[PDB]
Ligand binder design. Structure first.
Ligand SMILES: [Mg+2]
Lengths: 299, 7
């Protein structure tokens, strides 16, 4: 097929809501029996957003191995991501336990702790160097080493320490602070500038465990981020970029976690980001600098 | 607040 031509035909006819509902109708439905067990009721932020049993991340905990998190394993693209909900007050220890156990190097946060007067996620990382956090239930320590604040995103260097063994690991936290719930980024440039910062950090490298991506539910903004990244990888990977079918890729991702991409506009935005990102993939290396300037991260 | 999906 031809991605760019497809985008124009859908956009000109204003048919995004149509294709999006088709995706919702065609999406996989698998059991989430573990997530629904009463004992895990308080481990879920939302009653309607649960990980499928087949792809859920298991804590190496003998007590209760449940966490609302899913392993999105993209075979052809050769990349895996863990999408999870924003940690709750009682699951912050579980979250970092998962990060440790899965050997993740980066955490991508797409929501804000407070969104329009409502808390979408617990303050699960230290805000100050001198006030480290200790998660007693999972025996982990977390310290803020440094932070680089930009206009619409912040990158933080954290030190995670397994208190049992005393081993320590550097975790990179990429916080997109201006992506509204059920909304889209300011521009493909802002989004791509952020994605490439994550990519360049080395966090998405196959030598590390899967990057952990979350929003409030771990499906809308999270799905948008992963879909774009995966489509860009497939584009760079195969013979013909135009061959990448964004809808087919999204349906594949939905086999691993329900509701990835929550609005038709998020779907539309995904196309925009992949189309613009493809410029860099085909050869234009200068575009990367254009995105950066267009993003106004210095502001 | 308990439900995230918008009808
Ligand atoms: Mg200070």
């Amino acid at each position: 097929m031809e991605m760019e031509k497809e985008f124009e035909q859908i956009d000109k006819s204003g048919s995004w809501a149509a294709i999006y509902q088709d995706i919702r109708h065609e999406a996989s439905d698998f059991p989430c029996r573990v997530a629904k067990l009463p004992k895990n009721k308080n481990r879920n932020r939302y009653r309607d957003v649960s990980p499928f049993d087949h792809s859920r991340i298991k804590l190496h905990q003998e007590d209760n191995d449940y966490i609302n998190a899913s392993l999105i394993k993209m075979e052809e693209a050769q990349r895996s991501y863990i999408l999870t909900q924003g940690p709750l007050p009682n699951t912050c220890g579980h979250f970092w336990e998962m990060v440790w156990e899965q050997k993740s190097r980066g955490v991508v946060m797409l929501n804000r702790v407070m969104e329009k007067g409502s808390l979408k996620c617990a303050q699960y990382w230290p805000q100050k160097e001198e006030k480290e956090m200790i998660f007693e239930d999972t025996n982990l320590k977390l310290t803020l080493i440094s932070e680089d604040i930009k206009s619409y995103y912040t990158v933080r260097q954290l030190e995670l320490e397994n208190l049992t063994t005393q081993e320590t690991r550097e975790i990179l936290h990429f916080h997109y602070t201006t992506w509204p719930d059920f909304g889209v980024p300011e521009s493909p440039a802002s989004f791509l500038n952020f994605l490439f910062k994550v990519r360049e950090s080395g966090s998405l490298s196959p030598e590390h465990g899967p990057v952990v991506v979350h929003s409030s539910a771990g499906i809308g903004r999270s799905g948008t981020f992963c879909l774009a990244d995966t489509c860009l990888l497939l584009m760079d990977k195969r013979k013909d970029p135009s061959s990448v079918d964004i809808k087919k890729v999204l349906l594949e991702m939905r086999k691993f976690r329900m509701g990835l991409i929550q609005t038709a506009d998020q779907l539309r935005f995904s196309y925009l980001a992949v189309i613009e990102g493809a410029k860099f993939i085909m050869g234009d290396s200068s575009v990367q600098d254009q995105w950066k300037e267009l993003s106004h991260e210095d502001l | 607040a308990d439900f995230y999906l918008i009808p």
